[PDB]
Amino acid sequence: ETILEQQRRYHEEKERLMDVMAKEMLTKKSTLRDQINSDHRTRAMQDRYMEVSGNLRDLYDDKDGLRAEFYNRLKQIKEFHRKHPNEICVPMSLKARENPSEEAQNLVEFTDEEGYGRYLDLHDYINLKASEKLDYITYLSIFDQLFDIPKERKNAEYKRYLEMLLEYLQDYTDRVKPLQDQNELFFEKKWENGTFPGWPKETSSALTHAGAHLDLSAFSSWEELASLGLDRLKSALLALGLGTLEERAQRLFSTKSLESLDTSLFAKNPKSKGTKRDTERNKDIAFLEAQIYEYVEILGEQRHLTHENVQRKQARTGEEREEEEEEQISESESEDEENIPYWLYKLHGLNINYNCEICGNYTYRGPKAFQRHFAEWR
Amino acid sequence: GVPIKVLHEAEGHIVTCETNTGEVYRGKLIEAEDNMNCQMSNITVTYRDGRVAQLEQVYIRGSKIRFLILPDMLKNMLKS
Amino acid sequence: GKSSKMLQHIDYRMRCILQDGRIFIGTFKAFDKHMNLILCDCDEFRKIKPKNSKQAEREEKRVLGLVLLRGENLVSMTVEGPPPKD
Amino acid sequence: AHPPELKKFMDKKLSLKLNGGRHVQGILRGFDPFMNLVIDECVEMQNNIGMVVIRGNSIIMLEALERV
Amino acid sequence: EEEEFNTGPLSVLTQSVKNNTQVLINCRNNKKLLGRVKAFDRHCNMVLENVKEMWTEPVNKDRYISKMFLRGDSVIVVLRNPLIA
Amino acid sequence: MVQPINLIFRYLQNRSRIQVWLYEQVNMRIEGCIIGFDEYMNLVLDDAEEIHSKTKSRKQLGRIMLKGDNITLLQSVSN
Amino acid sequence: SLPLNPKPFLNGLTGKPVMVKLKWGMEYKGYLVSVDGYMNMQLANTEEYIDGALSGHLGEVLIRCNNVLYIRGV
Amino acid sequence: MKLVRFLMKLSHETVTIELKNGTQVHGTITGVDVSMNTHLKAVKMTLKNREPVQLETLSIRGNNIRYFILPDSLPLDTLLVD
Amino acid sequence: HTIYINNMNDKIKKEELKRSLYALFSQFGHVVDIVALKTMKMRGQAFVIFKELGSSTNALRQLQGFPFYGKPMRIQYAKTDSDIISKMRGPDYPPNYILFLNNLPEETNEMMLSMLFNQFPGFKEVRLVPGRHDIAFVEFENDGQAGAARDALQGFKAMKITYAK
Amino acid sequence: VKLTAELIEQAAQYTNAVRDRELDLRGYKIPVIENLGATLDQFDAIDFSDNEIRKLDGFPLLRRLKTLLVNNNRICRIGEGLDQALPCLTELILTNNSLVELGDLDPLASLKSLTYLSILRNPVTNKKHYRLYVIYKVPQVRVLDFQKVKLKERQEAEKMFK
RNA sequence: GGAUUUUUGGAGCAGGGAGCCACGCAUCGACCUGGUAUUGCAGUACCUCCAGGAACGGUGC
Structure with missing residues (x-):
């Protein structure tokens, strides 16, 4: 096998994919814009387009129609980028043949399926125009990633966690809204004004589950951003900074839950048996807490959006709440791309129950009619 | 029972069954009785040691079933 | 009187303990006379029920999915988390 | 007071898994609502024990050695 | 039914409640409960007073339980005696 | 079709010596001649024996009523 | 005998010395005072034989039905 | 007579229950039903060979109960009246 | 549809024999089932059942005398139809051992058809030789071998061979 | 005729003759x-x-x-x-x-449970020492080309290539 | 409304010792080397026999 051909086909496929996700970014600029905006608040350096472009949903001169679909295409582009990364990887890693090419001369076959099957394999399933999804990701379904209450990233469902929380505090004095008020705590509040004692079991377990949820939700709602990049960023921030909490009065706080006069005693405390014990037992929890913190910060807009939703639904009536639910439901299960003679009938013999077996086990109400079935189209 | 109706709904689907002894039987549910007696076909069985085997036809008594895994095709009885 | 003690926890995420000592966590959607249970998005745990075990919270976890458990083999249930909204 | 749906398995050779890690093989000759079975030409897994009664109580699983 | 509680094997329990006498209950848990029968039923559920629970672990052990309810399935044997005396 | 209860009724009439497999106990089985039985499969056995499969030892019992709880399986023996 | 059933057999054995084996391998010898519909059993002057050896002399005893393996007249 | 009826009266009592599997349960009864299925709150449950876990709520299948240890204060003679 | 194999090394355990048999014969078409016992009577033998008949004929001709676990296997068409085939599916001379017909020309010849017919121990009558070289009269000692030859070239891209029904 | 979930989903599925669950992907011209x-x-x-x-x-x-x-x-x-x-x-x-x-068969050395291997009717078969090469490089194989890997062959393959 | 498929139980109990490595007893099964018998058209508890090997597997105490 001549490597030249393989590497060629690779560069060609990469080109094909770039072209596909570029065509996408073209039809609906939001796809990139959306993504980029979020990226902006994670990696501050990122340069973002002119606001006007974002609003008018245009890339150069033409303003494109505003578009579940955005998210869909974002996950599709996600798998595309996965393919691309794979190919890039493998890639990083004459007369003799022309003679054997003479093999099997006599085949009556038309061969127009190398670039067409690929170009096609990655383009905007149906006969003509029913499903935006490419053949590449024809079995991609968002509803298996997002619940109905999340509305493809619009809201995050925290009712469940309100339940678990009630189970944690061993009472009922806590309302959904007071619970959200609790969540708001999450750079210093969640640490110095904790809902519960941060050494409580139930509490730490809860916090773990919740943290995990928030993180998965985050990356779920923003497929286009490099997950590994974000993860590593946060981890390094955790290791390198998080005596990051400093007070002019009490000094330096340690996530041992104690302060320290000066940096000196703080350092000579990070080798002590106490801190060794704690950092060796409560490491995973501390880290998870931190993640909950930063991921909730990155999702401030979604948190607010949901809290709002809560208050709304709460201030609804019965009919209102019902119709709203109807709406959320429809949004959830909708295609991502839209396209008298009484004795007369007895006398005449009609309205009498009868059945034809060969036709759909069909029912006929009259004998004259069924006798007319014998000559019919169906 | 409500769960029983949902079980009968899985007839004709591929299901997984663990017995009271922990043998794990996966295949097509042909018939499910009221008492949880289960007729299945074209089975893969995974014993407690990990080894697999293949069976054409089986029938397991309801009492000696620990649990069943049904498709997720059913999940969509929300009234109760 | 009320019959509610099971119906209350319906739709909630529930931690169920089996007679061999397994832990089944799923969404409690249905029960009956025998306490045969219907558990959506159900996973099985063996080693632990985590209360924030600093080493790890999860070992021998298995994704099962939609589970019907027979009541014969059920021991007990506690509330694990609130209902998922979906 | 239902019957087990076993008419399909009547007069077929079967493999019976019983409690205690016990296994026997034989031809189904009949049954009742408790799933008690009559098994003919039965063999303990191998030694021939003839026609026997298996109490449904102690029946874990059966497998047909034939096509039904 | 009362007749069957009165004269049948459960008369052991019927007699213990009436006379407020002690009985030793051999139990499935490999433990033995020694005390007085305040109430009982078909299943041999019981409400017991002044219960001395005894078992072994070899080391013998015991413990006092003033008031308790026993689910009757755990019953192996129930013994009446010159124990109360 | 032969019904299981009837098989027993046959065992009874025949006075065939019977060997019973017990529930969750493999090392011991019981033997005897069924004289009568009831709706719960409780059996009255004559000249009955405990059979130790491990020790090859037999314990002589005489008149036995075995609760049906223990019955796993019923077989006939020539002896 | 012409069909001798469980129930009559046990009733004939009331007033008699019996030994009951339990599923758990304990054995109890005594005079059968009575039995009931569920086959719960009442012994007097009971003795306990464990490993076939006299262990304890117990007196009057109720045995729950589910424990019983078999009963023998003796 | 039917002693489950007696147990059904013990809502809002705190008890210790020993299970068939050896587990020990201490909590406040919210409800006992006809199958002796028992429901509790503010529960400290100690599986055999663990340190306790605390649960806000726990629901026990009735058959899995060995026995209830009742409050010493409990006025049995009152509760046994129907 | 079923081929009968004999002269097999009977030291191979039954489940291994059947699995290698399945593997080896999968190259010609889907094998529906394999019947092989170790009784005195049946040891060293096996019945291999294929969904397609052309697959059975191809297998027979191509694996005749193939070294399997040390011995050269001998293959033949089975005497009767397999129970599984009869169930999946639902004249007195048939199966017949004389196949006469034509539609097999193209420089074809008598030593050609005589060697193709020769492949079979049933090689008895072979009539392919006039200017024709396209009329084939084949008398095969027995229908297992006539059926073997016929099943071997049962679609000589389409020739016409008609048993002397 | 690309391999597809859609292709796989309509494909004959059955319990084969050796009692295993098998999927039939045969004759689709998959590349x-x-x-x-x-x-x-x-x-x-x-x-x-x-x-x-x-x-x-x-x-x-x-x-x-x-x-x-x-x-x-x-x-x-x-x-x-x-x-x-x-x-x-x-x-x-x-x-x-x-x-x-022979070197193209090298990746099979990493399949730790591989016990039954058949490479017949491949050009590689006629290469000098093909059988001994497979035996030494893929020792986990017990049956090669429907013939038992024997001890004497293992030793002989240990000399050559040692 | 305690008698075989659920809620009045068939449960209960038994493992460290020796210097990371190795392990008592009983039953059953393939199983592995040699050699050897059979050439038989079937729908199957298993399937020749003879000698040697088991730092093999499962179950119970």
Whole structure:
């Protein structure tokens, strides 16, 4: 096998994919814009387009129609980028043949399926125009990633966690809204004004589950951003900074839950048996807490959006709440791309129950009619 | 029972069954009785040691079933 | 009187303990006379029920999915988390 | 007071898994609502024990050695 | 039914409640409960007073339980005696 | 079709010596001649024996009523 | 005998010395005072034989039905 | 007579229950039903060979109960009246 | 549809024999089932059942005398139809051992058809030789071998061979 | 005729003659092995006979796959991470394919459970020492080309190539 | 409304010792080397026999 051909086909496929996700970014600029905006608040350096472009949903001169679909295409582009990364990887890693090419001369076959099957394999399933999804990701379904209450990233469902929380505090004095008020705590509040004692079991377990949820939700709602990049960023921030909490009065706080006069005693405390014990037992929890913190910060807009939703639904009536639910439901299960003679009938013999077996086990109400079935189209 | 109706709904689907002894039987549910007696076909069985085997036809008594895994095709009885 | 003690926890995420000592966590959607249970998005745990075990919270976890458990083999249930909204 | 749906398995050779890690093989000759079975030409897994009664109580699983 | 509680094997329990006498209950848990029968039923559920629970672990052990309810399935044997005396 | 209860009724009439497999106990089985039985499969056995499969030892019992709880399986023996 | 059933057999054995084996391998010898519909059993002057050896002399005893393996007249 | 009826009266009592599997349960009864299925709150449950876990709520299948240890204060003679 | 194999090394355990048999014969078409016992009577033998008949004929001709676990296997068409085939599916001379017909020309010849017919121990009558070289009269000692030859070239891209029904 | 979940979903599924769950992928003219995820790891073995596959590669993690029938294809190369996606691969039938160099069979050394191997009707077969080379480089094989790997061959393959 | 498929139980109990490595007893099964018998058209508890090997597997105490 001549490597030249393989590497060629690779560069060609990469080109094909770039072209596909570029065509996408073209039809609906939001796809990139959306993504980029979020990226902006994670990696501050990122340069973002002119606001006007974002609003008018245009890339150069033409303003494109505003578009579940955005998210869909974002996950599709996600798998595309996965393919691309794979190919890039493998890639990083004459007369003799022309003679054997003479093999099997006599085949009556038309061969127009190398670039067409690929170009096609990655383009905007149906006969003509029913499903935006490419053949590449024809079995991609968002509803298996997002619940109905999340509305493809619009809201995050925290009712469940309100339940678990009630189970944690061993009472009922806590309302959904007071619970959200609790969540708001999450750079210093969640640490110095904790809902519960941060050494409580139930509490730490809860916090773990919740943290995990928030993180998965985050990356779920923003497929286009490099997950590994974000993860590593946060981890390094955790290791390198998080005596990051400093007070002019009490000094330096340690996530041992104690302060320290000066940096000196703080350092000579990070080798002590106490801190060794704690950092060796409560490491995973501390880290998870931190993640909950930063991921909730990155999702401030979604948190607010949901809290709002809560208050709304709460201030609804019965009919209102019902119709709203109807709406959320429809949004959830909708295609991502839209396209008298009484004795007369007895006398005449009609309205009498009868059945034809060969036709759909069909029912006929009259004998004259069924006798007319014998000559019919169906 | 409500769960029983949902079980009968899985007839004709591929299901997984663990017995009271922990043998794990996966295949097509042909018939499910009221008492949880289960007729299945074209089975893969995974014993407690990990080894697999293949069976054409089986029938397991309801009492000696620990649990069943049904498709997720059913999940969509929300009234109760 | 009320019959509610099971119906209350319906739709909630529930931690169920089996007679061999397994832990089944799923969404409690249905029960009956025998306490045969219907558990959506159900996973099985063996080693632990985590209360924030600093080493790890999860070992021998298995994704099962939609589970019907027979009541014969059920021991007990506690509330694990609130209902998922979906 | 239902019957087990076993008419399909009547007069077929079967493999019976019983409690205690016990296994026997034989031809189904009949049954009742408790799933008690009559098994003919039965063999303990191998030694021939003839026609026997298996109490449904102690029946874990059966497998047909034939096509039904 | 009362007749069957009165004269049948459960008369052991019927007699213990009436006379407020002690009985030793051999139990499935490999433990033995020694005390007085305040109430009982078909299943041999019981409400017991002044219960001395005894078992072994070899080391013998015991413990006092003033008031308790026993689910009757755990019953192996129930013994009446010159124990109360 | 032969019904299981009837098989027993046959065992009874025949006075065939019977060997019973017990529930969750493999090392011991019981033997005897069924004289009568009831709706719960409780059996009255004559000249009955405990059979130790491990020790090859037999314990002589005489008149036995075995609760049906223990019955796993019923077989006939020539002896 | 012409069909001798469980129930009559046990009733004939009331007033008699019996030994009951339990599923758990304990054995109890005594005079059968009575039995009931569920086959719960009442012994007097009971003795306990464990490993076939006299262990304890117990007196009057109720045995729950589910424990019983078999009963023998003796 | 039917002693489950007696147990059904013990809502809002705190008890210790020993299970068939050896587990020990201490909590406040919210409800006992006809199958002796028992429901509790503010529960400290100690599986055999663990340190306790605390649960806000726990629901026990009735058959899995060995026995209830009742409050010493409990006025049995009152509760046994129907 | 079923081929009968004999002269097999009977030291191979039954489940291994059947699995290698399945593997080896999968190259010609889907094998529906394999019947092989170790009784005195049946040891060293096996019945291999294929969904397609052309697959059975191809297998027979191509694996005749193939070294399997040390011995050269001998293959033949089975005497009767397999129970599984009869169930999946639902004249007195048939199966017949004389196949006469034509539609097999193209420089074809008598030593050609005589060697193709020769492949079979049933090689008895072979009539392919006039200017024709396209009329084939084949008398095969027995229908297992006539059926073997016929099943071997049962679609000589389409020739016409008609048993002397 | 790309391999597809849609293709895989309408494919004959059955319990084969050796009592294993098998998927029938035969005779579709598949050129590249891909999208196996959709089988959901539910098959003991897959029948890929009579297709146009060039390389035995592209498999997802499939823990239950124990038998691979790959007869009459165009296999000329074997992928390098096969054990990482097929840990219990026990039987591999490659009859009538295109493996030409002994070194191209090297990736099979990493399949720890591989016990039944068939490479007949491949040019590689006629290479000097082909059998001994396979035995030394893939010692986990017990039956090669339907013949028992014997001790004497193992020793002989230990001399040559030691 | 305690008698075989659920809620009045068939449960209960038994493992460390020796210097990371190795392990008592009983039963059953393939199983592995040699050698040897059979050439038989079937739908199957298993399937020749003879000698040697088991730092093999399962179950119970």
